[PDB]
Ligand binder design. Structure first.
Ligand SMILES: CCCCCCCCCCCC(=O)O
Ligand SMILES: CCCCCCCCCCCC(=O)O
Lengths: 177, 251, 280, 34, 251, 280
């Protein structure tokens, strides 16, 4: 799903009965795959950043379908978790789907200094993962899969400084007049 | 309403259809007063690094299940900072918050009983002069499940009579203990808040179990869908924990 | 009180962080509905236990004046002199438009309408192709629409009766001047969904027409061969903007158009693939 | 702490950068509604 | 007087002949204020369960010794609650209290230099384009002793030039750093109290060493008795420790 | 009252000297104990008979602003132009660091942390390898971390949409500009005892990363062979410092490291030997 709309959603299966992982991304504001969002694009014009981040998820399935999920954030200084037990030992939120179809968690600002480089190089800022909590249950004669969406925006303490030139665009030849 | 939101430490729990909440005996957890204190050393309070939500391993509910039970604080014996503090000290006390989640579709039927029992002393399985071994009352986070196949060391195992509350009292009178129901047509969650109850202000955490959690399916699970096995998940959060008597690690 | 803050750039303060305590209630600020087209208003002190912190950052560098008030190159003109037919060649004409350099174009195309004053600086360079250069003088004239456009080095249009002109000679500093907001409407157009009166020229090719910029060498016939290259830099002042737009993702191809197709070339963006999504 | 600021030309365009003012925090973008 | 008594947690230290005490830079340790805080989560303060005295392994002082050095907080990486908290979190800060004890008879002579150096960056041993390995700057509680026999991995070891302060500065100018002396004819103890110094309010505890302890015998040990080897013991006590950013254990 | 003193540099007065008389008592200020880690507080009027003297010296020149507020060279860049493949070569890139000149490095490494503003001056020089030089123009651009780094003379990165640039031409004075305190933390690191996230690069090689400085020649193709050498000078303003350290005793070998070993070379310091200690 490299050039299509399928790159914005992730599928859930009801044939899985186990505490498995769904996806995991890095929390650096200017790294892939969140470097191309609005906040990521704007941050590429500066060098330092600070503040908290907000993530939102929306469930797109049949109105008779139920599920429970776990969203966790891992502070830096350790490897990426591979089991639910390690993931639980941290900042996490438990989500239950109902009449409301959206949940929102935040990533607190935890760093030694006051600012971070938008291009860190070797350093990291943590990870965020998602795991099955109980199961995905469907009634008879229902599609056996569901989709998910993710959003991102900045909290009230977000800031930028030391403006620079972006690295997400280039000019190879000459623009025709 | 049906909406609830609980935030203990850095973790939050939400649910869109609940049935109120239960405070055991109408008392909220708190710290220890100087009027009742016995030991004289200064206690240690980890605060937010230990009063958070921990989730245990799930279990599978089928049409032939019979029940399960756990024990506290044995279940959280290795959950990070709480377990380390429990194993590094000699005395401790804490409250608890229990959340049970189990969801199904609109074409399922079934009912569960969730109860919290203080000083639940179980009975032995065989006759004669026998007692219960130590390893079988401390199964960790896996808990105990009632089955039928032959187990090892029959002279140390506990009984499997679920209908006798595992100790010789009739099921159905269990409603005096703090409890709640889970009806698949009404709700899918249960919440119980429990303070610290004991005859002494503080006690050893590795030789005494204050509380016990029991889950019993009163009505069998039945559906016509292709999803005939539903998982059940439990989360527990300590409240107002404090420890005393620092020494070397017991392990 | 006002000099101190702006000298220290301490304007535009940021709210602090308040402490919180464990809660358990019926109201759940974490739950919401995203189908309303609104942004959630959850703050860190609603889902976790926080500490009282006195913030000290100020958001002055993200203002529009700071963001758009930097000089950048917008054009490069090359003029080669010829010693044969001296009075016919040796002049250049360029039509003004801010749509030929990727950085400036992408920076300014983040909005739909803008209104600002301009500032122009010139950097002339002389390349020596002989034993010596001598004395060199150059003239630049601004031709508004409708004014006669010269077509020779010795044309009468260079008298500059009303047109503005500037002169430069070797050993002199860089010329600089200012321009006001010069448009018929109340703002500039970066995107136009319309045509002209003949139902042709779709885009911004019709609304934006600011005139031309001409240049020539004033020195008479000599025996030196040289090349002149001039670079033009632009900076905006007193800026306003409306209706932000998503940033550009691909390379530009033509001016006043949004086409991106390239012959014998696949579509390439800034997104990098992964082997598997369960490993960051 | 302080500094001098005098204009010399008769035109406004001739002057320097505008004094930073506000950010109009109320964002109609976040909540596009009356 | 010559008497001193210090009580940090549940431990007490006494000495009958000391020479005052040193407060590094004239600042007493304290907690972190909200004017300088960067992270927004609530910190955890173990208090008395971690601010206690820990004693390291002893070393032997002979007539041919040359010196030793340690690093902090690397030395206390496994001392109970402090080590567990250090390895379970991501950020932390603390002060320290150092006590060095070494006693002899009235027929011995010798002198030691005890100094505390901030951001002591040591130099490499060989020439060319070489650097210092990670394992050799984190020796634990055993510390590092200057010797002469060949070591493994020569391209990663640090230098042994004790007279150059291990980093290219002449010994004898080390008195600007907080320091004290131990003269066998005068005293047998040294005490230094140090606050938290850094360019950031809080920092990672496993990738940065704030302080360093150096012991150098300036005058050789000499006696005519049968006890020609004297041991040296070091005790360290954290002060006002706090941690933040809870996650899974790094180990 | 305040203009006069500082114009005359009469601030920071020094205490006077008081007269004394012969004494004989039980208290002995000369005796003390040096094991406490303290400095003795004996004054000349305690061990000898003195005269009343009104001192007149002032300690203004030993202040930090005076000590560190002097310009000094920190880099030298050499650029040789080639008439073949003109648009490929003829550019230079350097990474900013104050650790390549002995005098400045040793002067600043007397402390552990510092915080100051900077001031930069450039001194360009042109070497003529042909019959004439002609017209020469040069450009210098500052590239913060993360910004694209040009790799050709005609790269698009030279448009300088947001990056700061400066221009120089023959016959012009020396360029000069100022910089603020640009660091993520609250102070600069001259010594760092730590590693990176991969347990590599011990020292200050990871904390200090301020970007790069690039330069190029803007003049187009010509027929002259020249060499350009530019020197950069730096001076500090509004200085603060913490935690002094002993001065360096040996020669430096590498940047961001404290190694001093040299192949086939004995250790040499500033101490000179004597034949015998009883003869000064
Ligand atoms: C040398 C004069 C250059 C002045 C051009 C600045 C004004 C252009 C504003 C709109 C141009 C456009 O959007 O293409
Ligand atoms: C041309 C720009 C030069 C500015 C460098 C001055 C700031 C450097 C401060 C810390 C550098 C270091 O210590 O190596």
């Amino acid at each position: 799903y490299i050039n299509s709309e399928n790159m914005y959603s992730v599928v859930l299966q009801s044939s899985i009965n186990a505490p498995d992982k769904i996806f995991s991304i890095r929390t650096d504001v200017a790294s892939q795959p969140l470097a191309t969002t609005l906040i990521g694009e704007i941050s590429s014009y500066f060098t330092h950043w600070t503040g908290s981040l907000r993530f939102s998820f929306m469930f797109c399935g049949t109105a008779n379908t139920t599920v429970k999920l776990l969203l966790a954030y891992t502070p830096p200084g350790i490897a990426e978790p591979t089991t639910r037990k390690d993931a639980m030992l941290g900042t996490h939120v438990i989500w239950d789907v109902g009449l409301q179809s959206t949940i929102s968690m935040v990533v607190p600002w935890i760093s030694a200094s006051h600012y971070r480089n938008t291009s860190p190089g070797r350093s990291t800022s943590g990870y965020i993962t998602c795991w099955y909590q109980t199961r995905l249950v469907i009634p008879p004669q229902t599609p056996p899969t569901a989709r998910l969406l993710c959003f991102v925006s900045g909290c009230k303490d977000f800031c930028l400084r030391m403006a620079r030139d972006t690295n997400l665009h280039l000019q190879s030849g000459a623009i025709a007049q | 309403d049906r909406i609830i939101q609980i935030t203990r430490g850095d973790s939050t729990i939400t649910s869109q259809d609940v049935a109120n909440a239960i405070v055991a005996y109408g008392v909220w957890p708190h710290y220890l007063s100087s009027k009742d204190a016995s030991a004289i050393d200064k206690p240690s309070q980890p605060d937010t690094s230990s009063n958070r939500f921990y989730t245990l391993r799930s279990v599978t509910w089928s049409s032939s299940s019979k029940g399960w039970w756990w024990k506290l604080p044995d279940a959280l014996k290795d959950m990070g900072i709480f377990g380390e503090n429990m194993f590094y000290h000699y005395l401790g006390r804490s409250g608890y918050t229990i959340h049970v989640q189990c969801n199904a579709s609109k074409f399922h039927q079934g009912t569960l009983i969730v109860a919290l029992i203080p000083e639940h002393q179980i009975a032995s399985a065989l006759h004669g002069n026998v007692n219960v071994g130590y390893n079988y009352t401390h199964p960790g986070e896996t808990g105990r499940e009632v089955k039928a196949e032959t187990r090892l060391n029959p002279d140390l195992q506990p009984t499997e009579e679920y209908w006798l509350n595992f100790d010789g009292t009739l099921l159905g009178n269990i409603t005096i203990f703090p409890h709640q129901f889970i009806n698949l047509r009404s709700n899918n969650s249960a919440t119980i808040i429990a303070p610290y109850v004991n005859a002494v202000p503080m006690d050893s955490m590795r030789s005494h179990n204050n509380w016990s959690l029991v889950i019993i399916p009163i009505c069998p699970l039945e559906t016509s869908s292709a999803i005939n096995t539903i998982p059940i998940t439990i989360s527990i959060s300590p409240m107002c924990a404090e420890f005393s008597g620092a020494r070397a690690k017991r392990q | 009180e006002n000099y101190i803050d702006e000298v220290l750039n301490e304007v535009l303060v940021v709210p602090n962080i308040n402490s919180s305590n464990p809660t358990t209630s019926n109201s759940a600020p974490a739950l919401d509905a995203a189908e309303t087209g609104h942004t959630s208003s959850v703050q860190p002190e609603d889902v976790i236990e926080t500490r009282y912190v006195q913030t000290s950052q100020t958001r002055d560098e993200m203002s529009l004046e700071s963001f758009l008030g930097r000089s950048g190159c917008i054009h490069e003109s090359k003029l080669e002199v010829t010693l044969a037919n001296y009075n016919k060649e040796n002049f250049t004409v360029w039509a003004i438009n801010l749509q030929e350099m990727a950085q400036i174009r992408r920076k300014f195309e983040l909005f739909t309408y803008t209104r600002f004053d301009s500032e122009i600086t010139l950097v002339p360079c002389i390349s020596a192709l002989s034993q010596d250069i001598g004395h060199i003088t150059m003239q630049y004239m601004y031709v508004p629409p409708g004014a006669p456009v010269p077509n020779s080095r010795d044309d009468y249009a260079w008298q500059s009766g009303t047109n503005a002109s500037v002169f430069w000679q070797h050993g002199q500093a860089y010329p600089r001047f200012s321009l006001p907001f010069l448009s018929v409407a109340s703002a500039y157009y970066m995107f136009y969904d319309g045509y002209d009166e003949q139902d042709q020229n779709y885009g911004t090719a019709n609304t934006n027409n600011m005139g031309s910029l001409c240049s020539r060498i004033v020195t008479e016939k000599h025996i030196h061969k040289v090349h002149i290259m001039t670079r033009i830099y632009h900076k905006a002042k007193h800026v306003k903007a409306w209706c932000p737009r998503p940033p550009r993702a691909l390379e530009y191809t033509r001016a006043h158009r949004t086409n991106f197709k390239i012959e014998d070339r696949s579509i390439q963006t800034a997104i990098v693939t992964r082997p598997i999504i369960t490993t960051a | 702490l302080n500094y001098f600021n005098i204009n010399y030309f008769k035109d406004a365009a001739s002057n320097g950068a505008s004094k930073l003012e506000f950010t109009q925090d109320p964002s109609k973008f976040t909540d596009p509604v009356k």
